[PDB]
Ligand binder design. Structure first.
Ligand SMILES: O=C(O)C(F)(F)C(F)(F)C(F)(F)C(F)(F)C(F)(F)C(F)(F)C(F)(F)F
Ligand SMILES: O=C(O)C(F)(F)C(F)(F)C(F)(F)C(F)(F)C(F)(F)C(F)(F)C(F)(F)F
Ligand SMILES: O=C(O)C(F)(F)C(F)(F)C(F)(F)C(F)(F)C(F)(F)C(F)(F)C(F)(F)F
Ligand SMILES: O=C(O)C(F)(F)C(F)(F)C(F)(F)C(F)(F)C(F)(F)C(F)(F)C(F)(F)F
Ligand SMILES: CCCCCCCCCCCCCC(=O)O
Ligand SMILES: CCCCCCCCCCCCCC(=O)O
Ligand SMILES: CCCCCCCCCCCCCC(=O)O
Ligand SMILES: CCCCCCCCCCCCCC(=O)O
Length: 581
């Protein structure tokens, strides 16, 4: 109302307010120590409480943008430490605010955050939970300055749930370590996803983005009328566009206003939002973004009537090409929550190509009579890819599925570095476990959701240091062609076997003494090097060498004086292996 900071403090509650202020400041003042940020937070919090006590107390009617900038410009070492950023303080609002957005550091050169020992974590968590939690919130925020602050706070609350539970349990390490792995992977995916949607808006443009949203919103809210979906898609593009411009408060206000619109209109949208729409502002937009798909209307026609049979198909199309194509996308996607959005975009684009050709024909109805037959192969290709891979994740388990991928992908693009081949192949196997566990109807969307970040990881890595033309081609293909292109890659014909290196296939007794993870990575590193040396080896021959090594490790980890039969019984492996292939 009169005091933005008082209204924020009253909507958020003191605990959330303090945490969000810490995140916000940590993301701009990335090189100031924890101590100094605790101080900014306590000052902003005591100021906010004076505004809550009296909205017309001094400085309480200042904009939150103004107060944020004022406190940044108050920092004593700002020019010494952040240089150019201090020059933003010479400008007036709103130009000061825009100058700060430009001058955050993407890659602050901070050491990797090392996971301490369970004992050390659980003790620190016990002795001062808030300093432990807030210090890690600070460490993560300074390192991820574009991470949406409310989403970083939702992660913090899950970390705190994981410590509260696990620091009291019998086997602390057995409880905690898997939860921290899941959270790390979920957090990294959310950080990659957030960056990619903004890069993609810029790369592929606003039209592609609105198509993507029509498809997603129609799957989620299949009972909403097209005009409601189109209104939601218009507001969603504005939210996403503001959010990518990088102003946290503008992004939060835009999200909150859309959340409120959706909650005020549940009857026109979904029967699934009641619980989300009872949450406080902080959790409401988060909650909606995760909501389950509504059930579609039971009694939906064939799309044939409006999109093939109707004699007004070309007239309807020519009148507003993107609205008609959007209506097609809406009707297709509301019927297929089991499809990837990109599959729905391939279908939409196939229909566009066909109406473009055939609406420029004397008997349009004849030219486009059988358009629906072109959808058959497009739909099956990813359905088959999922069946074949999710039934291999069955036969094998996660680890041996990663191994099957390792051999498949090393043979397709053997020029890729071993660490990239091991990383992507491990990650693609963990996409198996996230998504092959889901029923049929959720498999292709789960797969899409996780492949988009996995293949972006692989591409970004790749275009910073290229190695393969065919990878570059798939990475610079259209949105809809990227995955099909990767899946179309054939075993590399032109690749020359890599010259045998004796070191690479030398193992010691330490291998018996590594975590499960490090031992899998050492083995997977060797496997890739095996395929790189002998790319001609077949399934039968590689299984034979793998089973030989498998039998070697088990024998040479049981034996007395292990490190010798590793040297000795291990040179027998490497000779027997070379000949055999
Ligand atoms: O690109 C990255 O930097 C990344 F986001 F870390 C990613 F590794 F690609 C990832 F998608 F997060 C992921 F961790 F591989 C994963 F989430 F897909 C997973 F495989 F671990 C899960 F199981 F979550 F799918
Ligand atoms: O690969 C891309 O860059 C792309 F933009 F995603 C696309 F393939 F062109 C598309 F977005 F799907 C699309 F074809 F333009 C469309 F399907 F979105 C549309 F044109 F049909 C509609 F009007 F439906 F938005
Ligand atoms: O974009 C999607 O993937 C989606 F599924 F359509 C959606 F995420 F539900 C969303 F509805 F678009 C949305 F962004 F989550 C939202 F609008 F519902 C919101 F409430 F989160 C915001 F806050 F954006 F309003
Ligand atoms: O078709 C499939 O099996 C798939 F799983 F959907 C796929 F993920 F797209 C993939 F094609 F396997 C792949 F992961 F994209 C890839 F093979 F292209 C690669 F990323 F692993 C490499 F590095 F080999 F290019
Ligand atoms: C999100 C704020 C609080 C986070 C508390 C967790 C700190 C311990 C784990 C940090 C190490 C990096 C994450 C990981 O690899 O699991
Ligand atoms: C002066 C420092 C104030 C900065 C605090 C930022 C507060 C963010 C509010 C987030 C509200 C949630 C909205 C949403 O994502 O739907
Ligand atoms: C081995 C890859 C991940 C595990 C599940 C198999 C995924 C293959 C199909 C993915 C296709 C969805 C996106 C698309 O339509 O292009
Ligand atoms: C000249 C080639 C040396 C032969 C050594 C092969 C090492 C690779 C085996 C990788 C094992 C993965 C599967 C398993 O656990 O058995």
């Amino acid at each position: 109302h009169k005091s933005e900071v008082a209204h924020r403090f009253k909507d958020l509650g003191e605990e959330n307010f303090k945490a969000l202020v810490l995140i916000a400041f940590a993301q701009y003042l990335q090189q100031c120590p924890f101590e100094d940020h605790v101080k900014l937070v306590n000052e902003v919090t005591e100021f906010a409480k004076t505004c809550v006590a009296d909205e017309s107390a001094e400085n309480c009617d200042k904009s939150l943008h103004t107060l944020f900038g004022d406190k940044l410009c108050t920092v004593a070492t700002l020019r010494e430490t952040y240089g150019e950023m201090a020059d933003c303080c010479a400008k007036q609002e709103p130009e000061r605010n825009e100058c700060f957005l430009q001058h955050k550091d993407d890659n602050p050169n901070l050491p990797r955050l090392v996971r301490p020992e369970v004992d050390v974590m659980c003790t620190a968590f016990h002795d001062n939970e808030e300093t432990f939690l807030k210090k890690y919130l600070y460490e993560i925020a300074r390192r991820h300055p574009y991470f949406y602050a409310p989403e970083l706070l939702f992660f913090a609350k899950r970390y705190k749930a994981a410590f509260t539970e696990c620091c009291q349990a019998a086997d602390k390490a057995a409880c905690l370590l898997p939860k921290l792995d899941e959270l790390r992977d979920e957090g990294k995916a959310s950080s990659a996803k957030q960056r990619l949607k903004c890069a993609s808006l810029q790369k592929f443009g606003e039209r592609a983005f609105k198509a993507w949203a029509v498809a997603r919103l129609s799957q989620r809210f299949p009972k909403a009328e097209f005009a409601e979906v189109s209104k939601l898609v218009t507001d969603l593009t504005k939210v996403h566009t503001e959010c990518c411009h990088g102003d946290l408060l503008e992004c939060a206000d835009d999200r909150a206003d859309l959340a409120k619109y959706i909650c005020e209109n549940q009857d026109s949208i979904s029967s699934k939002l009641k619980e989300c729409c009872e949450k406080p502002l902080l959790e409401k937009s988060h909650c909606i973004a995760e909501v389950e798909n509504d059930e579609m209307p039971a009694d939906l026609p064939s799309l044939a009537a409006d999109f093939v049979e109707s004699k007004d198909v070309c007239k309807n199309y020519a009148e507003a090409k993107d609205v008609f194509l959007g209506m097609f996308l809406y009707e297709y996607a509301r019927r297929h929550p089991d499809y990837s959005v990109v599959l729905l975009l391939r279908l939409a684009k196939t229909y566009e190509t066909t109406l473009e050709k055939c609406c420029a024909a004397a008997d349009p109805h004849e030219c486009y009579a059988k358009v629906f037959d072109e959808f058959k192969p497009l739909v099956e290709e990813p359905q088959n890819l999922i069946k074949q891979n999710c039934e291999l994740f069955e036969q094998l388990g996660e680890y041996k599925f990663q191994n099957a991928l390792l051999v498949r992908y090393t043979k397709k693009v053997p020029q890729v570095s071993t660490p990239t081949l091991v990383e992507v192949s491990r990650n693609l196997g963990k996409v198996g476990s996230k998504c092959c566990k889901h029923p049929e109807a959720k498999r292709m969307p789960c797969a899409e959701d996780y492949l988009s970040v996995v293949l972006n990881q692989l591409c970004v890595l790749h275009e910073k240091t290229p190695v393969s033309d065919r990878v570059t081609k798939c990475c610079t293909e259209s949105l809809v062609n990227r995955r099909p292109c990767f899946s179309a890659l054939e075993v590399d014909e032109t690749y020359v076997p890599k010259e045998f290196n004796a070191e690479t296939f030398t193992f010691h007794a330490d291998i018996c003494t590594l975590s499960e993870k490090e031992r899998q990575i050492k083995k997977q590193t060797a496997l890739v090097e095996l395929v790189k040396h002998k790319p001609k080896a077949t399934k039968e021959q590689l299984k034979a060498v793998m089973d030989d090594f498998a039998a070697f490790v088990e024998k040479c980890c049981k034996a007395d004086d292990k490190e010798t039969c590793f040297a000795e019984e291990g040179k027998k492996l490497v000779a027997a292996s070379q000949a055999a292939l």
